[PDB]
């Protein structure tokens, strides 16, 4: 689980 | 220079307009391109920057709620636009989740990202 | 609960409307409140937050240009609103200056601030 | 100052 | 230097620190929050010859969150300054990094601010 | 642990660290030139028993910017993780705090990031 | 500079 979309933060 | 479509290295797609009044508006979405991954952004930029080679200061926010999903969190990006042959936006970000008071100490993540107009 | 006026400990005055679309719009100014000290802000907030006492996530930006001054810089605040009798907006901020590439390493300050409904 | 000090309560 | 002592942050964590003549910080940290129990080793550095113009004393330290009771696979650094006078205080910002996979590295680092005093606050 | 030795950022700034069985990081940080006036003491901590699930090794360190030649009245902390394998790296975020008067404390702390590798550029 | 620029990836 993530606290926000990972793609948006340069990750995931 | 700022107005356009920007990408991070995952292909996350930042579609922004830089208005005459210092406004940033637009959307941010995943490389998959689906509506469920698209979010509103708004921010501000220096509409009369230095012209000595310095970058243009700017910032924006996305709250992680759209018509489909809500993470109960919001990210702000603070950074600068660097013009030239390969224009770039370099940012630091803060991601804050809504929390109880007891968990507020661990509410905020920090990181960085860089954007260019070149689709990866 | 967000719409209205908020103050830091110095009495700096944050005037915001939280729209039904998730938008934050308003102005930020000094305790004196003269026009030269007033700047536009815009941001976003969670318009359907938890109902359990948790805070409401939000953020906003001020670019430090108005019709009188321009510092070539911008601050973003990331934080949460907590309502009730002693309502608060608790934030951390990043202040980025426009710099040359050689000075970019020292472009971004970090800090914090807390806003309340009374001075 | 890099921006107005009044706007930035804690460092 | 004024730094050696037992300090408490706003969450009730306990910071037991010694400042050495050479700029060393040593001691133990006990966190009131997070994946932590009992004391952890800390080390860091401080300015052993601060400015004479009223400025605070710059310092920083690290705790890796491993001891014989648990290992959170994480480390926190506090960066700040000591301010002497009537109500002595150490004001800090901190970064808590967890060991992650590359895919989760984006969410590896929490940030916050702690203020330490000689009083343990409620 | 894979941490002991010399690490370089993209400018060739150079830290030489020992990562002990005690969880200690001890060493020096200096410029690419490496003259004595550029060298400062580094002290920190790392996770000496990291997870075995493909996660990095958490660590952090501090440099106070005082040596025998200069004193900037400031200190930087780096918080990050060591990532082993074919191209080992230490990825960090940092906080640089200056000693300030109370009036200037709001602008005391810079934030940034840096990545270190074993290969001098 | 508030500290050596080289140490912070800049200058
Ligand atoms: Na929530
Ligand atoms: Na430790």
Numbering used by the authors:
A (entry chain E): 1 to 12
B (entry chain D): 16 to 135
C (entry chain A): 16 to 134
D (entry chain H), G (entry chain F): 2 to 12
E (entry chain B): 15 to 136
F (entry chain C): 15 to 135
Text of the article:
As a proof of concept, we used this platform to identify both known and novel L- and D-amino acid peptide binders to the well-characterized model target, streptavidin. All peptides bind within or near the biotin binding pocket of streptavidin formed by two surface loops [1/2 (amino acids 22–28) and 3/4 (amino acids 42–52)], and by antiparallel β-sheets involved in an extensive polar interaction network, in which residues Ser88 and Thr90 of β-strand 6 play a major role. The surface loops of streptavidin are flexible: upon biotin binding they undergo a conformational change to form a closed conformation, but to accommodate the peptide ligands, loop 3/4 is dislocated by 13–16 Å from the biotin closed form to adopt a well-defined peptide-specific structure. All eight L- and D-peptides discovered in this work bind to the same pocket of streptavidin in distinctive binding modes suggesting (1) the rich malleability of L- and D-peptides and (2) the ability of streptavidin itself to adjust the flexible loop to accommodate multiple peptides with diverse sequences and conformations.
From these “secondary” peptide families identified in the initial screen, we chose three 5-mer “hot spot” sequences: LAEYH, PAWAH, and FDEWL. We used a series of array peptide libraries rationally designed around each of these sequences to successfully evolve the three sequences to 12-mer L-peptides. Strong correlation between specificity in the substitution plots and co-crystal data was also observed for the AFPDYLAEYHGG peptide (the highest affinity for streptavidin in SPR measurements) and the RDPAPAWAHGGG peptide (the longest stretch of highly specific amino acids between positions 2 and 11) (respectively).
